[PDB]
Amino acid sequence: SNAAVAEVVRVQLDVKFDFDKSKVKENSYADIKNLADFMKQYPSTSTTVEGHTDSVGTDAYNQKLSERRANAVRDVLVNEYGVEGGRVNAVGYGESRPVADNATAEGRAINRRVEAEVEAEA
């Protein structure tokens, strides 16, 4: 084993979605642009846009919904803000990775989400 140290700058994005919707809400465009700003300034970086659902419905339905959400955020980054599409990787995890309790409406809302991050040397 060996010791390690590193210093990086990191932008982390969390976009929430309405029930059974993959539309990016208007109040999230500015947040998404912050991630685009970062990628423009560090051209060697890329990002994986990760979609999720709450647990209402089948695993298979939610796998596809999670992928539609990730692609909707990717479309904003690429089409609206001009990040090269090869630098933005859209994937979905369906309902399999909750960060809140699916037993409550509030927890389900938190789970209906896309997360993305970018890091670069600092």
Ligand SMILES: C[C@@H](NC(=O)[C@H](CCC[C@@H](N)C(=O)O)NC(=O)O)C(=O)O
């Ligand atoms: C009652 C509502 N039920 C549904 O199962 C779904 C979507 C669930 C989506 C959810 N997991 C999310 O993360 O948003 N809608 C559908 O089956 O087409 C309904 O059917 O009205």
Ligand SMILES: [Cl-]
């Ligand atoms: Cl770079």
